[PDB]
């Protein structure tokens, strides 16, 4: 069963700048040191990109602000996060986010990703349970804190997990887990790239173009998505539904897509460097 745990927080969200961030090879074409121009949905350059806060310990051990929203998915979203602790596990791509409506799901057990599209019953605040399992610190990742019911649902997929916890283990760069999603003609497309950002606070001035991970034969009318979080189930705590969870805090950056064209600079390594409008 699920819980309601935002319940008091509505403070205005923060904004930031998408300087040169959110580019990707929109094809599997091998190319050379040439100049190319492509038109598709893209994150606008220097867009007034939205920044959120997930679990937010804004207080001297006092408060655990937690405000993950659902979000519109007008035509495509750009998603990125630092979140050194792998507290983000996937997304809840959908339109209605309840029964009688097949919706998409993204979760990954730190060793492999599993993908579902189903007539779920996503509760108002989905999340995952991360908690020791009596066997050598091991922990299961039950997902009953997400959907009270999933059934009679068509498509499925399993693969290696996106979120590679590369050997950083100190913390100066955070690798800025980054993503771009679009859904057209019933096909759902995935782009990402781990990339260290030694900059302490905000998005980089550098350039790095994502790559097509997997294109998904989905055929769903995705209109509004919600990110999916993972919380560390507390131990014996007075109250267990709306109470102790969430080791670590989190936040992520979100910026919508829009149709556009851009001129790109390939290399002998076929690596894009910049685009213009």
């Amino acid at each position, epitope marked *: 069963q699920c819980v309601n745990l935002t319940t008091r927080t509505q403070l205005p969200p923060a904004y930031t700048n998408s300087f040169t961030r959110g580019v990707y090879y929109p094809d599997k074409v091998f190319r050379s040191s040439v100049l190319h121009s492509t038109q598709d949905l893209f994150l606008p350059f220097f867009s007034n990109v939205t920044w959120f806060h997930a679990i937010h310990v804004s207080g001297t051990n006092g408060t655990k602000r937690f405000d993950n929203p659902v979000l519109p998915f007008n035509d495509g979203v750009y998603f990125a996060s630092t979140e050194k602790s792998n507290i983000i596990r996937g997304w809840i791509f959908g339109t209605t986010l309840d029964s009688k409506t097949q919706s998409l799901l993204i979760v990954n057990n730190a060793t492999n990703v599993v993908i579902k599209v189903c007539e779920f019953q996503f509760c108002n605040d989905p999340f995952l349970g991360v908690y020791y*399992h*009596k066997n050598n610190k091991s922990w*299961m990742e*039950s997902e009953f804190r997400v959907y*009270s*019911s999933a059934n009679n649902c068509t498509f499925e997929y399993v693969s290696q997990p996106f979120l590679m916890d590369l050997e950083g283990k100190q913390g100066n760069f955070k690798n800025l887990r980054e993503f771009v999603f679009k859904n057209i003609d019933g096909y759902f497309k995935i782009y990402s790239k781990h990339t260290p950002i030694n900059l302490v606070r905000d998005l980089p001035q550098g350039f790095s173009a994502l790559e097509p991970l997997v294109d998904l034969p989905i055929g769903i009318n995705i209109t509004r998505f919600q990110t999916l979080l993972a919380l560390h189930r507390s131990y*014996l705590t*007075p109250g267990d*539904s709306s109470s102790g969870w969430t080791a670590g805090a989190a936040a992520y950056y979100v910026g919508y897509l829009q149709p556009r064209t851009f001129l790109l600079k390939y290399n002998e390594n076929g690596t894009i460097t910049d685009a213009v409008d």
Partner: antibody
Amino acid sequence: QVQLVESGGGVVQPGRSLRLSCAASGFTFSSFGMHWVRQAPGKGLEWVAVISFDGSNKYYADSVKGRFTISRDNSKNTLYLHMNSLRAEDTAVYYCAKDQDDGYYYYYYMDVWGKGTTVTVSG
Amino acid sequence: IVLTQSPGTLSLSPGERATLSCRASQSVSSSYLAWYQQKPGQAPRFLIYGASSRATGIPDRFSGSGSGTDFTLTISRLEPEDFAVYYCQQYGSSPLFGGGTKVEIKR
């Protein structure tokens, strides 16, 4: 629709073992701790034992501590109460009931209950 | 730990307000008290948690309050089926069931 049924009750002589079964149907069964509550005739309910939904945690009352064990098969959607060294006072009606949450190291009230099976310990 | 209700039994005609004392040896963490109603030949139903929170499908006449080491279930007006033993439970870090409390029709 939410409903539990339990079986495995009946006679047994002291010292033997009996394995109570509680079958479940009508909710995402492998998502809730399950308690065992017994009620000897003429006495009030005495809580016995509760199992974590995945079984990682088990707790028992000192009344049966070290002498009862709890197990469950989430695939079968069924609850198993293992008992050995069944003393005389142990005979009672036995109720299986579900937690209200992930009984992990913590146990809400039992919210919906089965229908009870009777065990009688006698030579 | 030992929790005890009071009195041993309560005998009332239909309709009159009835209270069911619940005294705890120690203070129950965060008022994690629950109540139950059990009719002979049946299974206990779940009435109130948190010493005040009415549960689903429960008539509004059932209510209660308390904190610390002193609790009370109250039923404003009684109906013929409302006469069955009541159990007072605390559920923090370990369960414990009260000794039981029976409500009786008097004449």
